[PDB]
Amino acid sequence: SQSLYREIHQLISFKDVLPDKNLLPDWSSNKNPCTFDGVTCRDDKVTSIDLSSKPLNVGFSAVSSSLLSLTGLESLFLSNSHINGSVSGFKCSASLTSLDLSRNSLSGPVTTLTSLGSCSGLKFLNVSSNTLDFPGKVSGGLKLNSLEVLDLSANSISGANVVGWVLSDGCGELKHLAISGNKISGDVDVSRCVNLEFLDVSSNNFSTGIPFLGDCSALQHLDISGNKLSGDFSRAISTCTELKLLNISSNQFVGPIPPLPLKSLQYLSLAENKFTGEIPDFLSGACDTLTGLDLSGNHFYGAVPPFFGSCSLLESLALSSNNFSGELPMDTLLKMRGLKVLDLSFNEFSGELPESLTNLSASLLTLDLSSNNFSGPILPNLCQNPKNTLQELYLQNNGFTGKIPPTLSNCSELVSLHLSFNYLSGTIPSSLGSLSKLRDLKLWLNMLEGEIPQELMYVKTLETLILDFNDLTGEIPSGLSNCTNLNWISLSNNRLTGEIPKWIGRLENLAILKLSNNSFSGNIPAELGDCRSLIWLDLNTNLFNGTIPAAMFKQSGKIAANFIAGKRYVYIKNDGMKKECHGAGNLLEFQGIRSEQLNRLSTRNPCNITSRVYEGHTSPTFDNNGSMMFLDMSYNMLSGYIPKEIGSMPYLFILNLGHNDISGSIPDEVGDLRGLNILDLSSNKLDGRIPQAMSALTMLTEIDLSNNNLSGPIPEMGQFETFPPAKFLNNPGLCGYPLPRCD
Numbered sequence: 179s180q181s182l183y184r185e186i187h188q189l190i191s192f193k194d195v196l197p198d199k200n201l202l203p204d205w206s207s208n209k210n211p212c213t214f215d216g217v218t219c220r221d222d223k224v225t226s227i228d229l230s231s232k233p234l235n236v237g238f239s240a241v242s243s244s245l246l247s248l249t250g251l252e253s254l255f256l257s258n259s260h261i262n263g264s265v266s267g268f269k270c271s272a273s274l275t276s277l278d279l280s281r282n283s284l285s286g287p288v289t290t291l292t293s294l295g296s297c298s299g300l301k302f303l304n305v306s307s308n309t310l311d312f313p314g315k316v317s318g319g320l321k322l323n324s325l326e327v328l329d330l331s332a333n334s335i336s337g338a339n340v341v342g343w344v345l346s347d348g349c350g351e352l353k354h355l356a357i358s359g360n361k362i363s364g365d366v367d368v369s370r371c372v373n374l375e376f377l378d379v380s381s382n383n384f385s386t387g388i389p390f391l392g393d394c395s396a397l398q399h400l401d402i403s404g405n406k407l408s409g410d411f412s413r414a415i416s417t418c419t420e421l422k423l424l425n426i427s428s429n430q431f432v433g434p435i436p437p438l439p440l441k442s443l444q445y446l447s448l449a450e451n452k453f454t455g456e457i458p459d460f461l462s463g464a465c466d467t468l469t470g471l472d473l474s475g476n477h478f479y480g481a482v483p484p485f486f487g488s489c490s491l492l493e494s495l496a497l498s499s500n501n502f503s504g505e506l507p508m509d510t511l512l513k514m515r516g517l518k519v520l521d522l523s524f525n526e527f528s529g530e531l532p533e534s535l536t537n538l539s540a541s542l543l544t545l546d547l548s549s550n551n552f553s554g555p556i557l558p559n560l561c562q563n564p565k566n567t568l569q570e571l572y573l574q575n576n577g578f579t580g581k582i583p584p585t586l587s588n589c590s591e592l593v594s595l596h597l598s599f600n601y602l603s604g605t606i607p608s609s610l611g612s613l614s615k616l617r618d619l620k621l622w623l624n625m626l627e628g629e630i631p632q633e634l635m636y637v638k639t640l641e642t643l644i645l646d647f648n649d650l651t652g653e654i655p656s657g658l659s660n661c662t663n664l665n666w667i668s669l670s671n672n673r674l675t676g677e678i679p680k681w682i683g684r685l686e687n688l689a690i691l692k693l694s695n696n697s698f699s700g701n702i703p704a705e706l707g708d709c710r711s712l713i714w715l716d717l718n719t720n721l722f723n724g725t726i727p728a729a730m731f732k733q734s735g736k737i738a739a740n741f742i743a744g745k746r747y748v749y750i751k752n753d754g755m756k757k758e759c760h761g762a763g764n765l766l767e768f769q770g771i772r773s774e775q776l777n778r779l780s781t782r783n784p785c786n787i788t789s790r791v792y793e794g795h796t797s798p799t800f801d802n803n804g805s806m807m808f809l810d811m812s813y814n815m816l817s818g819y820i821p822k823e824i825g826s827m828p829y830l831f832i833l834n835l836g837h838n839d840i841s842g843s844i845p846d847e848v849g850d851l852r853g854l855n856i857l858d859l860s861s862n863k864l865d866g867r868i869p870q871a872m873s874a875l876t877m878l879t880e881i882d883l884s885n886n887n888l889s890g891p892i893p894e895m896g897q898f899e900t901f902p903p904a905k906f907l908n909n910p911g912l913c914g915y916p917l918p919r920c921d
């Protein structure tokens with residue numbers, strides 16, 4: 179057959195235009211393509227090709243001429259294959275059914291896809307996650323009316339009535355339409371698409387009309403979430419009898435929960451809206467089929483109605499961030515056999531934990547009661563039932579008292595324990611080290627005393643250890659060296675003593691290290707510069723002495739921070755008003771806690787919290803090849819001179835070496851820190867002239883060189899003219915504006 183001779187030559191030609199050789203090493207001439215990797219054959223004839231997740235790095239023109247023209251080819255999967263360029267006219271095999279070009283660098287107007295109409299048998303098309311757009315006026319049509327499945331999601335499409343453009347030539351055969359994650363706005367009319375089952379217009383710019391669904395005869399999945407929609411969606415979906423999933427979350431809908439089609443409903447999300455009232459009784463109509471419910475981020479109140487006990491298929495119930503009050507409805511919750519996730523966080527649920535809660539320790543994967551008015555002791559009988567399935571236990575930001583039950587070790591599947599922000603006293607039970615799967619241990623802001631258990635070394639999966647603001651004494655356990663997956667360690671505000679161990683450098687995943695307000699002594703380890711992930715170091719208010727090692731900045735430029743991202747935090751800026759407040763600012767973990775309860779720190783901290791709070795999710799300014807972003811060693815007994823290597827950290831935002839015994843002169847390399855915002859070298863024995871090179875710093879919003887032996891003229895260029903005289907005071911030999919003219 180000529181087609182067989184043609185098949186092999188086209189495949190090999192495609193291999194040869196690949197910039198990277200050896201990418202398809204088993205592809206070779208004078209061999210049967212059915213033996214090639216990525217190829218699928220039926221009766222010794224290629225029917226499908228899959229080169230997904232291979233960095234092909236070639237233009238679409240290569241694909242179209244070599245691959246899409248192959249006789250008998252039924253499907254082609256090139257997802258995440260690093261293909262760029264634009265789609266354009268080409269001869270397409272009439273047998274081609276599915277084409278996946280998702281997650282690539284395809285560019286140009288979305289009108290380029292119309293040329294795929296040369297594929298007569300095309301039915302499935304995935305061009306999601308590319309850079310396709312819609313320049314200027316929207317006119318004409320996509321003109322692919324034979325498609326059953328189309329995914330234009332996560333592109334750069336921006337325009338009004340782009341959906342109408344897609345459906346202009348007809349949607350009679352269309353079963354699945356996803357256009358999510360764009361900037362499309364205007365009207366959505368799928369009433370002519372009588373076989374439509376899946377519709378996702380989420381994360382767009384729709385601010386006016388709700389999609390018109392017509393008879394809505396075949397619709398099962400409807401996602402309009404992540405828009406600016408308001409109005410009466412109830413009436414719009416009222417005719418949809420086959421509806422299974424309804425996601426209207428993150429919109430501007432108001433009022434009480436309206437009527438919904440419940441008979442086939444599996445998933446329902448009303449989350450992140452302006453809905454009010456209490457959970458109506460009529461929702462019991464979904465209890466036969468309802469798998470998941472999310473009412474979070476609204477103004478709902480009252481108590482969880484009793485009818486929920488009839489929903490035995492409900493796997494997930496999220497009522498977080500509302501005004502639900504009363505005690506824990508253990509009556510209804512025990513009637514739900516299939517519930518694996520309970521989230522009542524950020525509510526006003528009050529009272530002590532009922533003893534029947536222990537029954538859900540063998541059922542629930544996630545129990546989140548964080549930020550509530552719960553009081554009394556933590557149930558010691560928690561996880562009494564054998565084979566406990568509990569993974570996440572969030573009890574933070576409550577009125578819990580007493581001791582941490584050592585019995586919590588009986589929950590062996592626990593990956594996250596958050597007991598922070600409570601009135602818990604006693605010590606940390608050493609049995610917690612017996613948790614082989616534990617990743618996050620957060621107990622901060624409690625009255626916990628004693629020492630940090632040495633037995634924690636038996637947790638090789640440990641990632642975050644947050645013990646801030648307790649009465650913890652003793653030294654850092656030598657066994658923590660065995661936890662190599664540690665990224666976030668914060669032991670600040672305790673009475674901890676000893677030194678930073680030399681094995682600290684052996685933690686290659688360590689990103690944040692905060693030891694402030696302790697009695698830590700000794701010298702700063704040179705092995706701190708063996709940490710490849712460290713971007714945040716806060717050692718302020720300790721007994722550290724000796725000279726700053728130059729080697730600690732050795733990884734500068736090599737730093738890689740990845741796993742640290744995505745974690746919720748508060749950063750409380752230091753108000754320079756009060757002398758009792760130390761450090762540049764307080765970085766603290768803040769998952770599942772209200773900023774409104776930050777006043778609980780008032781008794782434990784001298785700093786004023788008023789208008790100095792920054793809240794977000796950890797977001798490094800780089801991925802690989804970065805540097806330390808934060809460095810604070812202020813209020814210590816550090817001596818010697820600042821090493822010139824200090825200026826090797828271009829991503830450093832803040833540098834506070836204030837209140838030390840550091841001598842010498844400010845190195846000229848400080849002027850190479852081009853990302854620097856704050857620079858506090860005040861209250862030291864620094865002498866000499868301020869290096870003119872510091873005039874190159876364009877990002878400084880704050881500086882303090884006061885209380886030093888600095889002399890000579892202040893640099894006249896740069897940002898020095900911006901800063902007030904107060905920042906240079908108590909420097910006898912220092913002159914020039916903002917100070918008086920030199921003599």
Ligand SMILES: *[C@@H]1O[C@H](CO)[C@@H](O[C@@H]2O[C@H](CO)[C@@H](O[C@@H]3O[C@H](CO)[C@@H](O)[C@H](O[C@H]4O[C@H](CO)[C@@H](O)[C@H](O)[C@@H]4O)[C@@H]3O)[C@H](O)[C@H]2NC(C)=O)[C@H](O)[C@H]1NC(C)=O
Pocket residue numbers: 257280281304305306307327328329354
């Ligand atoms: C068009 O292409 C896009 C891009 O691929 C595609 O979106 C992606 O769909 C896949 C599913 O095929 C998603 O991947 C899943 O992610 C969830 C978590 O959200 C995982 O739990 C899933 O794991 C399953 O699959 C794995 C192997 O694939 C198994 O190892 C595992 O045990 C589970 O069985 C699954 O990986 C992905 O998140 C999205 N988004 C992306 C990739 O950006 C879209 O679906 C395509 N359109 C159509 C109509 O198919």
Ligand SMILES: *[C@@H]1O[C@H](CO)[C@@H](O[C@@H]2O[C@H](CO)[C@@H](O[C@@H]3O[C@H](CO)[C@@H](O)[C@H](O[C@H]4O[C@H](CO)[C@@H](O)[C@H](O)[C@@H]4O)[C@@H]3O)[C@H](O)[C@H]2NC(C)=O)[C@H](O)[C@H]1NC(C)=O
Pocket residue numbers: 332358359360380381401403404425426427428445447450
């Ligand atoms: C019900 O609907 C809600 C709301 O839509 C939904 O929660 C959302 O899930 C989506 C996942 O599909 C989230 O989308 C991502 O969010 C992250 C976090 O910020 C972003 O970084 C992501 O950005 C990428 O994707 C964009 C395209 O969407 C790209 O333009 C961008 O460059 C990135 O590649 C992405 O937006 C979304 O954040 C949440 N929203 C909320 C409020 O939780 C929920 O999953 C739905 N539930 C069901 C069962 O369908």
Ligand SMILES: *[C@@H]1O[C@H](CO)[C@@H](O[C@@H]2O[C@H](CO)[C@@H](O[C@@H]3O[C@H](CO)[C@@H](O)[C@H](O[C@H]4O[C@H](CO)[C@@H](O)[C@H](O)[C@@H]4O)[C@@H]3O)[C@H](O)[C@H]2NC(C)=O)[C@H](O)[C@H]1NC(C)=O
Pocket residue numbers: 671672695719758759760780781782783784785
């Ligand atoms: C390092 O950690 C130690 C130990 O936590 C810490 O010492 C604490 O400092 C706070 C900050 O002031 C002290 O809090 C005080 O406690 C007394 C009770 O003895 C309160 O009466 C005080 O209340 C004042 O503030 C209230 C509102 O904020 C007012 O209503 C009231 O009238 C007072 O003005 C005050 O809060 C705490 O007592 C000490 N504890 C100990 C054991 O020393 C230290 O500050 C930390 N160091 C650094 C640099 O952070």
Ligand SMILES: CC(C)[C@H](C)[C@@H](O)[C@H](O)[C@@H](C)[C@H]1CC[C@H]2[C@@H]3COC(=O)[C@H]4C[C@H](O)[C@H](O)C[C@]4(C)[C@H]3CC[C@]12C
Pocket residue numbers: 690713714747749751763765792795796797798799807831832855856879
């Ligand atoms: C990488 C993470 C651990 C880190 C928290 C990161 O997520 C977060 O964005 C950090 C970089 C933020 C949190 C607080 C921010 C600072 C907030 O408070 C600071 O005083 C302001 C003051 C001034 O505005 C400076 O221009 C920025 C500056 C100095 C910000 C520098 C960057 C931050 C320090």
Ligand SMILES: *[C@@H]1O[C@H](CO)[C@@H](O)[C@H](O)[C@H]1NC(C)=O
Pocket residue numbers: 235236237262263264
């Ligand atoms: C496609 O990617 C290659 C590889 O970098 C590049 O040389 C080429 O210019 C790109 N084409 C377009 C149209 O951007």
Ligand SMILES: *[C@@H]1O[C@H](CO)[C@@H](O)[C@H](O)[C@H]1NC(C)=O
Pocket residue numbers: 336338361363383385
């Ligand atoms: C959303 O739509 C409005 C109205 O057409 C428009 O003014 C606005 O620019 C759009 N937003 C984006 C991000 O394109």
Ligand SMILES: *[C@@H]1O[C@H](CO)[C@@H](O)[C@H](O)[C@H]1NC(C)=O
Pocket residue numbers: 479501503526
């Ligand atoms: C939340 O509910 C409680 C219950 O009594 C009520 O006192 C409080 O005012 C409610 N919150 C708001 C903002 O109305």
Ligand SMILES: *[C@@H]1O[C@H](CO)[C@@H](O)[C@H](O)[C@H]1NC(C)=O
Pocket residue numbers: 699700701723724725
């Ligand atoms: C630092 O303090 C320790 C005692 O805590 C002392 O032995 C050591 O000599 C000091 N370092 C310097 C450089 O003086």
